């Protein structure tokens, strides 16, 4: 029945994951205790996609919470919708990962990974027809980055024929915890290139700029940043969670969006970012605007391979179709000519909370290379002096593995530039 298994790893992965569940539980009418109290059967028609039906007509998220320290997951359990999560699905260590990819991937995380897989297996076994997996994590830390990609590697071994997608938060010096973030990110990107079908690249620099420049927040917190991520994740999963014209699972959606296996790193977008409702032209304009992009990449610096757009709310579908056909025919130079009709649009009647109507952007642009270039610059800047490497070699890693990760991402960059000049 097209069930999705959700996994969240690390500090960022769990805090963002929790907000996601907090938002969609509200949309489906599920209270923190797991009881349904909505007002429409449309909220329950595809409730099985992310929720398991309990004994007493309760709905428990198909989510698995992973960390190497209990700090963040204790905060989740003490949160608003904390009691909604299945207790056994809380898998945690005590040591922590210390913002170290090696600790998450090779030492500390390796000691815990089988425990997570047992929970994954337990959730998967009770699925009528498993649709795929979904991971929320950061790439700049240790747990979500190192253990997260290790989990993905394991899942692909046990479930080679299942879709593996991630919502990955990209590190940025503007919003940074440690200096080793480019090290952890480069190591993780190599894993994602090979072992995921779709990765939504969420840039913290972009999130910061949106909160500061647009949302007019002088001192943006992680909470403010996760508000944008939560709203985007809701929009991306809207067509999967609600009835509509679109009858597609993760695989079919992946087929129409990914023309080349390695090039599957998407730029998320959202509109609006107020009492005055937006018009369809305004939604479409903002949706394609760089200021609504969350990968911190300028789409004009590249070309769109494929584009997906999801509209929510009661609106003129003719006007939507006209406006989408307006942007494409006014900026046809930014869409590849060797992929006919690469821009697809879906509408959903049920709007998110607080907005009468909204729009979510999913772009497979070659401009995403700017993100990897940026990470690669920061990486090389330290690695040429072998700086901070002792943290990693102390966990058993060799310099060669760093050189290889560096080379694979430069290859990824070169691959993107290959189709930008096509």
């Amino acid at each position: 029945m097209r069930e999705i298994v959700h996994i969240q790893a690390g500090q960022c992965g769990n805090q963002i994951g929790a907000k996601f569940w907090e938002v969609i539980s509200d949309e489906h009418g599920i209270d923190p205790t797991g009881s349904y109290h909505g007002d429409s059967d449309l909220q329950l028609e595809r409730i099985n996609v992310y929720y398991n039906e309990a004994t007493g007509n309760k709905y428990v998220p198909r989510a698995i919470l992973v960390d190497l320290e209990p700090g963040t997951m204790d905060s989740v359990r003490s949160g608003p919708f904390g009691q909604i999560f299945r207790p056994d699905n809380f898998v945690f260590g005590q040591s922590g990962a210390g913002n170290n990819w090696a600790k998450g991937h090779y030492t500390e995380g390796a000691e815990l990974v089988d425990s997570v897989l047992d929970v994954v297996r337990k959730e998967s076994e009770s699925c009528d027809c498993l649709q795929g997996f979904q991971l929320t994590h950061s790439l700049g830390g240790g747990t979500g980055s190192g253990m997260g990609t290790l989990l993905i590697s394991k899942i692909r071994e046990e479930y080679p024929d299942r879709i593996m997608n991630t919502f990955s938060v990209m590190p940025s010096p503007k919003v940074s915890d440690t200096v080793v973030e480019p090290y952890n990110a480069t190591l993780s990107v190599h894993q994602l290139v090979e072992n995921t079908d779709e990765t939504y690249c969420i840039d913290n620099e972009a999130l910061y700029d949106i909160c500061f420049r647009t949302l007019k927040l002088t001192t943006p917190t992680y909470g403010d940043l996760n508000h944008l991520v939560s709203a985007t994740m809701s929009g991306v999963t809207t067509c999967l969670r609600f009835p509509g014209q679109l009858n597609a699972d993760l695989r079919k959606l992946a087929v129409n969006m990914v023309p080349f296996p390695r090039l599957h790193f998407f730029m998320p977008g959202f509109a609006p970012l107020q009492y005055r409702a937006l018009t369809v032209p305004e939604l479409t304009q903002q949706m394609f605007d760089s200021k609504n992009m969350m990968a911190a990449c300028d789409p004009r610096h590249g070309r769109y391979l494929t584009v997906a757009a999801i509209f929510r709310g009661r609106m003129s579908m003719k006007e939507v179709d006209e406006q989408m056909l307006n942007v494409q025919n006014k900026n046809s130079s930014y869409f590849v000519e060797w992929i006919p009709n690469n821009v697809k649009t879906a509408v959903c009647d049920i709007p998110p909370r607080g907005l009468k109507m909204s729009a979510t952007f999913i772009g497979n642009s070659t401009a995403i290379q700017e993100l990897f270039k940026r990470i690669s610059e920061q990486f090389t800047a330290m690695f040429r002096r072998k700086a901070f490497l002792h943290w990693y070699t102390g966990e058993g890693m060799d310099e060669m593995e760093f050189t290889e990760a560096e080379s694979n991402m430069n290859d990824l960059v070169s691959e993107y530039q290959q189709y930008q000049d096509a």
Binding site: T107, L150, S153, G394, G396
Partner: protein, 67 residues
Amino acid sequence: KREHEREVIQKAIEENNNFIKMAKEKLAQKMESNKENREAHLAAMLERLQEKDKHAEEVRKNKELKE
């Protein structure tokens, strides 16, 4: 990839164990070298003082061979 994961963690164990091994050996070398040196220092000191005894006995003996 699995066997690489094994090689990394066992390399971490090997390096940590070698560090402990080296530290234990270097320390055992130093405390032993120090013990030998300090004993030899006091051995030489007492031998000089025991030489003064040999000289003192000859002094009393030399006077005895004058009476």
